[PDB]
Design an enzyme around this catalytic site. Structure first.
Site, short mmCIF file in Angstrom:
data_model
loop_
_atom_site.label_atom_id
_atom_site.label_comp_id
_atom_site.label_asym_id
_atom_site.label_seq_id
_atom_site.Cartn_x
_atom_site.Cartn_y
_atom_site.Cartn_z
N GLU C 280 13.28 -1.97 -8.20
CA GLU C 280 13.85 -1.50 -6.95
C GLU C 280 15.35 -1.30 -7.08
O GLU C 280 15.91 -0.35 -6.51
CB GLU C 280 13.53 -2.49 -5.83
CG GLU C 280 13.98 -2.05 -4.45
CD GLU C 280 14.12 -3.20 -3.48
OE1 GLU C 280 13.14 -3.95 -3.30
OE2 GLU C 280 15.22 -3.36 -2.89
N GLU C 283 15.60 2.20 -8.84
CA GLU C 283 15.61 3.35 -7.91
C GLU C 283 16.79 3.30 -6.94
O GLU C 283 17.17 4.36 -6.42
CB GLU C 283 14.34 3.58 -7.07
CG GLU C 283 13.04 4.02 -7.76
CD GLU C 283 12.21 2.92 -8.33
OE1 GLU C 283 12.59 1.76 -8.14
OE2 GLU C 283 11.18 3.21 -8.96
N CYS C 300 7.61 -4.66 0.84
CA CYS C 300 7.12 -6.00 0.52
C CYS C 300 5.87 -6.37 1.32
O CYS C 300 4.97 -7.03 0.80
CB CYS C 300 8.22 -7.03 0.77
SG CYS C 300 8.58 -7.32 2.51
N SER C 320 9.88 3.46 -0.32
CA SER C 320 9.96 3.16 -1.75
C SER C 320 8.61 3.41 -2.40
O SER C 320 7.58 2.96 -1.89
CB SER C 320 10.40 1.72 -1.99
OG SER C 320 10.32 1.38 -3.36
N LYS C 359 -3.10 -8.37 3.65
CA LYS C 359 -3.45 -8.07 2.27
C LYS C 359 -4.92 -7.71 2.12
O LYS C 359 -5.25 -6.83 1.32
CB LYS C 359 -3.11 -9.26 1.39
CG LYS C 359 -3.16 -9.01 -0.11
CD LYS C 359 -2.01 -8.11 -0.54
CE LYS C 359 -1.73 -8.23 -2.03
NZ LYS C 359 -2.86 -7.75 -2.87
N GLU C 362 -5.39 -3.99 2.24
CA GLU C 362 -5.02 -3.05 1.18
C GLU C 362 -6.01 -3.09 0.02
O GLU C 362 -6.11 -2.13 -0.75
CB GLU C 362 -3.60 -3.32 0.67
CG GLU C 362 -3.36 -4.69 0.05
CD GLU C 362 -3.71 -4.76 -1.42
OE1 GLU C 362 -3.78 -3.69 -2.07
OE2 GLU C 362 -3.97 -5.87 -1.92
N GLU C 367 -6.57 3.90 -2.85
CA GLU C 367 -5.53 4.67 -3.53
C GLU C 367 -4.74 3.80 -4.51
O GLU C 367 -4.11 4.32 -5.44
CB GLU C 367 -4.60 5.31 -2.51
CG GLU C 367 -5.30 6.36 -1.67
CD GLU C 367 -5.72 7.57 -2.48
OE1 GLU C 367 -5.02 7.91 -3.45
OE2 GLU C 367 -6.76 8.18 -2.14
N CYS C 506 7.45 -15.07 5.40
CA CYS C 506 6.08 -15.38 5.03
C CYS C 506 5.82 -16.88 4.97
O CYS C 506 4.65 -17.28 4.88
CB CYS C 506 5.72 -14.74 3.68
SG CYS C 506 6.13 -12.99 3.54
S1 SF4 Z 1 3.15 -13.22 5.73
FE1 SF4 Z 1 4.07 -11.98 7.39
S2 SF4 Z 1 5.91 -11.05 6.43
FE2 SF4 Z 1 4.62 -11.81 4.72
S3 SF4 Z 1 3.35 -10.01 4.14
FE3 SF4 Z 1 2.12 -11.19 5.65
S4 SF4 Z 1 2.63 -10.24 7.65
FE4 SF4 Z 1 4.23 -9.54 6.19
#
Ligand code: SF4
Ligand code: SF4
Ligand code: SF4
Ligand code: SF4
Ligand code: SF4
Ligand code: SF4
Ligand code: SF4
Ligand code: SF4
Ligand code: SF4
Ligand code: SF4
Ligand code: SF4
Ligand code: FES
Ligand code: FES
Ligand code: ZN
Lengths: 199, 583, 583
Positions: C280, C283, C300, C320, C359, C362, C367, C506
């Site tokens: 990062e 770039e 992120c 990004s 997560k 995804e 893709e 997080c």
């Molecule tokens: S814990 Fe919260 S800030 Fe971290 S990836 Fe998950 S939603 Fe986003």
């Protein structure tokens, strides 16, 4: 009750240790019992299943709880209250109980159920879907029909119906209300002509 | 001793022979589930939750009582054994009552912990349970067999540890219930009301009757002034209710929490215990100067005197006529403080917190009434106090500290060790030695008899002319054997036999809150509460002799006159009759 | 501020304006039940469990909502209030399914604590519940209205502090229930997989998809080798569900535990995060030196980037091209390790943990694929790991410590602070200052905008020729308002925009085990996460800088040439597309 049934496809079976265990049954004391078409093979599985509930020593929870909790699946079929997929609920207890037993009954208890399903799966579907006993043995799944040619129409069976599901006029074969009698069967023997058959 | 070599999960262990895989794997930091097992008493393995596969076996074996052997390989993470444990779990759950919101046990039921432990989700089953019969006719213990899951731990502990065994298993299948004999009730047989049965049940099949509705009516009645007494051992394990670390004393915080409840007055046992020891020593010197009935025993714990009366009443001349110390302080409060404050004795209420379960039986007795009124009204244990203070819900850890009051809040170490093992008669020996020959002793050793543990012998001279023989027995089996040799007359030479009903003494009362099987595995808990009370006793910085107490001497001079007075015979000393045996 | 007087239980107190009875009583060591209230967000009082008696009132009033006045004496221990709350708790108990053996949190559900606290005895009130359906179609979060008690807190926390507002109330009477718009599934409507929807529901009506069965299937095959992965911020939350005190690092202990579970390879997110920060920065240099699109924004979190592509498709050219670190680790592990070790890519399985619940979305996305193969095929959460380890139920508190393996598990503090709020920009400015101007910085002055908490602005002189502005925005409202002002183009001057989906970092993510609202009253838990993380960071004895690791440059001139190589443009950078909106 310690073994299993041997159908007509296995008449050339050499009866010994390695063949009948491969056929999923064990000799035990060596009792041999022969069945015919005149009795339903559903409830006779419950008959050996009657033996294990009334004799269980009451220590391990499968041989206490899992036994009688497995009766009501059979009898709801035996009175027509069952639903599709209950036979696959039986197969859940099929391998669970045999690996979870202490008393010598528990290993050998459900094997009569195990033996019959791998040959006689279709006749349960007659009990489950068609709601009809092939041998005419299951009391709540059988109905009585008379024959018009052999029946005199005297009305002796009309006196012997406690639910009064049969009615009509003299000198002619009567009418039968299927849903009204309790299917006690008191009318079939009172006919001196044998005009009543099981459907 | 033989050494056994075996590998679990590829890890080799050398063990003494006879030890099993459960505790050996626990030593290797591996856990196996358990409901059935408890140490030294119950090894039957009927729970069928502790399964594990053993290579070279026809079928699976339970790890609880499977003995170790050489050259065997153990693997505990096959899918089949997990499936077996789960299927046994729903077959248990289809029997055991599912309204666990309103269970008494509620939070830390073992069955809930195991249900979350195996992570079962589906219950595909409908079934029929055992019969629902409420036996709300006894005095202390109520059974709800709709919850009971046939652990057999209760019958085992009443069978061997108690040596009472008034319980059995009857019927076949679903009719197989644990019951008393003849389909009677516990009040209809000789239940000791020990409390071991109600504390060792892992699912709350045994409960105690609430009296708290009467308590809440009493505190809501302005015409009644409330006095609440405290035990020396109530704070021994109360803090473990709040997740406190082990052996914590919260006595000032306890007093502040009680005073935040709106309770009018708060006293303790300690003066009553001191005076009870006084007349115990006084009747001792009387019977050794007059040649009284020997061997002599105490009268403290009501459970064993009920035991010895109902079972083998032939030793009935050997009892003491005095009451329990809590009865003594209840009577003293009911008469002398009543005439002090000029308040009618029918206008206040007394409640006392005891970890022993026999007191709610003893309050129902008819002969322990004074001046036409009952000695005590309501008896409360620690579980009841526990969710009562949790019901009023003052967040306990942030309270300040408070002390007790005038007169009856002072404490000495001799009644700090009242709940301990034999401290009562230890203090009795101290007091009689100080009276007769002025001997300063702080500790006296005990002799362990080889063959049976729990019986302790001591024999230290009070004077070079008079030596006194001491034995202390705790636990129902120990009571039975010392009673057997007393009928044999083996201890005809001794002077004192001290009977503790529950094992480990008065400090293992059944009214203490429930402990986990895991917690019983790690640290033997009477050791930790013993360290807490012994640090309290060494922390007593004022007085370690009972008779030096000026307050009790003042009460002797002003109302009690002289030790073993005729008035003391009238008030402080009573009589028991033949209670029927339906056994 | 205005000073107002009251008396609580006969104790006088002066409080400022706005102080309610509930918080003042808690300040004055008095505890009152609540389900309705949470700090600063949900103040409706609709649970009606917080009733306190106020003298002179016609009926009782709720403590949370009632504002104080001058000189009112109130009490909280009446028979009236206790009977009223008993009636209301009996009433509210009727709906939720009493099958608590299958309730997902089970022992942490505070409704169970209220049940065992208020002495509810029977359930006299049977009946019929609402219209049942289960929407088990969404890939992240599943609802079940059989357990919901309609506290409105879920819709309140999604509506305002997140600024998403995709939930609402429907119907009258029992037809009143919490639903999205027009009763379709959450998968096709504008839900963002926030995870604050689930973390604040008090009854467990909101649940994850427990996908442990294919974890067991993957570990059950011997031919499939398994590679587990630890997020840099999970270790501050395991002891929370093990009852540990605040901020205890259980790092080597959980390493030893996952080694004891038999998993084939163990690694961390640290090294891939280091690679991502270096990339990062590369770039950054590329876009600054070529005058690219400003500002550039990282990637992120999957949550807010999915939020933008489902809401604001006009903002695409500022993103990004790099992915999340976990995808990068998966790709490098299935390419470089596979080619080095000659192990077939489709015969390997990689599972990783991260508390961010978005997560699981995804992994659904096709893709993010390398040669048609998904980068990571399976992932679990911290609560999922807790449930699995309690299936394993290893005795956690007595493990030794271990270290990870070579090469890919090395440790630097610059990505120890990766899990905190804004440490990504800290490490980025560190590496760009060391590359371009040889500047060694550790901490940055922060000026927070007055009146708004969660937005943070700074201006760091990276070079004397070029000064770079810093904007850190975490929390849904902050993201919403920075989106609104960049939409008008007010903030064209800055270069870094830090959008963070969850508020508070997080370390305040979804997957972390539940904390009660009572413990959030005393200390905000993100503070002790920050202290544990900072103590872990300050004790790193070898490196504090990212690009100074030998292993990353070893893999650079070994396999990946340089950052922004054409091959790296094909495997480390990719494009994003807008998503359909049906709100
Ligand atoms: S814990 Fe919260 S800030 Fe971290 S990836 Fe998950 S939603 Fe986003
Ligand atoms: S299987 Fe054996 S141990 Fe189990 S209940 Fe039956 S007789 Fe008892
Ligand atoms: S008794 Fe026989 S012949 Fe007479 S009416 Fe009945 S069926 Fe017909
Ligand atoms: S089966 Fe019994 S009840 Fe039915 S018609 Fe015949 S006699 Fe009547
Ligand atoms: S045994 Fe008691 S505590 Fe355990 S689930 Fe049943 S009712 Fe609840
Ligand atoms: S009382 Fe407790 S230990 Fe005894 S059988 Fe019943 S549930 Fe099991
Ligand atoms: S209280 Fe004691 S004596 Fe009574 S049944 Fe229980 S264990 Fe036996
Ligand atoms: S505490 Fe133990 S010894 Fe004392 S009365 Fe109670 S049960 Fe008996
Ligand atoms: S949320 Fe409902 S089902 Fe879950 S533990 Fe609490 S009361 Fe039981
Ligand atoms: S789903 Fe949960 S948070 Fe939302 S209203 Fe129902 S109980 Fe409250
Ligand atoms: S996941 Fe996010 S958008 Fe969906 S309900 Fe929860 S907070 Fe709202
Ligand atoms: S304790 Fe029941 S199987 Fe071992
Ligand atoms: S939060 Fe419960 S009544 Fe207000
Ligand atoms: Zn049939």
């Amino acid at each position: 009750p310690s073994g299993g049934c041997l159908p007509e496809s296995l008449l050339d079976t050499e009866i010994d240790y390695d063949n009948l265990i491969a056929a999923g049954s064990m000799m035990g004391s060596g009792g041999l019992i022969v069945m015919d078409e005149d009795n339903c093979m559903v409830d006779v599985a419950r008959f050996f299943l009657d033996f294990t509930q009334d004799e269980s020593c009451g220590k391990c929870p499968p041989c206490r709880i899992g036994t009688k909790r497995m009766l009501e699946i059979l009898e709801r079929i035996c009175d027509g209250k069952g639903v599709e997929g209950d036979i696959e609920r039986l197969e859940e207890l099929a391998v669970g109980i045999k690996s979870s037993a202490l008393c010598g009954l528990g290993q050998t208890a459900p094997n009569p159920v195990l033996s019959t399903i791998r040959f006689f799966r279709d006749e349960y579907e007659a009990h489950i879907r068609d709601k009809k006993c092939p041998a005419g043995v299951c009391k709540h799944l059988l109905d009585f029909k008379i024959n018009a040619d052999t029946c005199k129409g005297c009305g002796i069976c009309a006196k012997k119906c406690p639910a009064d599901a049969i009615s009509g006029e003299k000198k002619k074969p009567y009418n039968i209300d299927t849903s009204k009698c309790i299917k006690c069967g008191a009318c079939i023997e009172a006919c001196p002509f044998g005009s009543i058959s099981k459907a | 001793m033989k050494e056994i070599t075996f590998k679990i999960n590829g890890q080799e262990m050398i063990v003494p022979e006879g030890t099993t895989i459960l505790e050996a794997a626990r030593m290797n930091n591996i856990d196996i589930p358990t409901l059935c097992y408890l140490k030294d008493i119950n090894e039957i393995g009927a729970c069928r939750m502790c399964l594990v596969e053993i290579a070279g076996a026809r079928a699976l074996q339970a790890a609880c009582v499977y003995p170790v052997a050489n050259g065997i390989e153990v693997l505990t993470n096959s899918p089949k054994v997990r499936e077996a444990r789960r299927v046994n779990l729903e077959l248990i759950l289809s029997n055991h009552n599912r309204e666990c919101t309103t269970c008494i046990r509620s939070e830390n039921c073992e069955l809930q912990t195991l249900a979350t432990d195996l992570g079962v989700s589906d219950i595909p089953f409908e079934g029929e349970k055992s019969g629902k019969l409420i036996d709300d006719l006894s005095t202390s213990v109520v059974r709800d067999e709709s919850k009971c899951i046939l652990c057999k731990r209760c019958v085992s502990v009443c069978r061997d540890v108690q040596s009472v065994a008034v319980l059995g298993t009857v019927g076949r299948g679903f009719t197989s219930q644990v019951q008393p004999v003849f389909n009677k009730s516990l009040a209809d047989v000789g239940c000791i009301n020990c409390g071991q049965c109600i504390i060792n049940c892992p699912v709350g099949a045994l409960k105690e009757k609430s009296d708290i509705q009467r308590v809440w009516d009493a505190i809501a009645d302005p015409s009644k002034t409330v006095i609440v007494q405290t035990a020396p051992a109530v704070r021994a394990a109360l803090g473990e209710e709040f997740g406190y670390p082990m052996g914590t004393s919260v006595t000032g915080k306890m007093a502040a929490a009680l005073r935040r409840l709106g309770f009018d007055k708060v006293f303790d046992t300690d003066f009553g215990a001191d005076v009870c020891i006084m007349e115990e020593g006084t009747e001792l010197i009387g019977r050794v100067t007059n040649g009284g009935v020997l061997p002599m025993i105490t009268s403290c714990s009501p459970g064993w005197i009920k035991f010895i009366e109902t079972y083998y009443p032939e030793a009935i001349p050997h009892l003491s006529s005095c009451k329990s110390p809590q009865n003594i302080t209840g009577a003293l409060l009911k008469n002398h403080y009543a005439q002090t404050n000029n308040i009618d004795p029918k206008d206040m209420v007394v409640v006392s917190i005891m970890p022993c379960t026999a007191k709610k039986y003893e309050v129902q007795r008819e002969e322990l009434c004074t001046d036409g009124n009952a000695d005590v009204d309501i008896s409360i244990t620690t579980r009841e106090l526990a969710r009562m203070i949790k019901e009023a819900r003052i967040l306990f850890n942030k309270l300040p500290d408070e002390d007790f009051d005038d007169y009856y809040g002072e404490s000495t170490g001799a009644a700090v060790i009242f709940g301990a093992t034999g401290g009562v008669m230890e203090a009795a020996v101290r007091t009689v030695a100080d009276v007769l020959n002025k001997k300063d002793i702080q500790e006296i050793d005990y002799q362990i008899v080889r063959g049976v543990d729990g019986i302790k012998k001591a024999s230290v001279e009070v004077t070079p002319d008079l030596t006194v023989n001491l034995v202390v027995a705790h636990g129902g089996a120990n009571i039975r054997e010392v009673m057997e040799q007393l009928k044999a007359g083996e201890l005809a030479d001794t002077h004192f036999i001290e009977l503790m009903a529950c094992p480990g003494g008065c400090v293992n009362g059944g009214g203490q809150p429930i402990v986990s099987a895991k917690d019983k595995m790690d640290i033997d808990i009477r050791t930790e509460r013993a360290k807490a009370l012994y640090d309290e006793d060494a922390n007593v910085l004022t007085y370690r002799k009972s008779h030096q107490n000026p307050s009790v001497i003042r009460l002797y001079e002003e109302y009690l006159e002289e030790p073993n007075s005729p008035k003391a015979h009238h008030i402080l000393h009573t009589k028991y009759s033949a209670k029927p045996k339906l056994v």
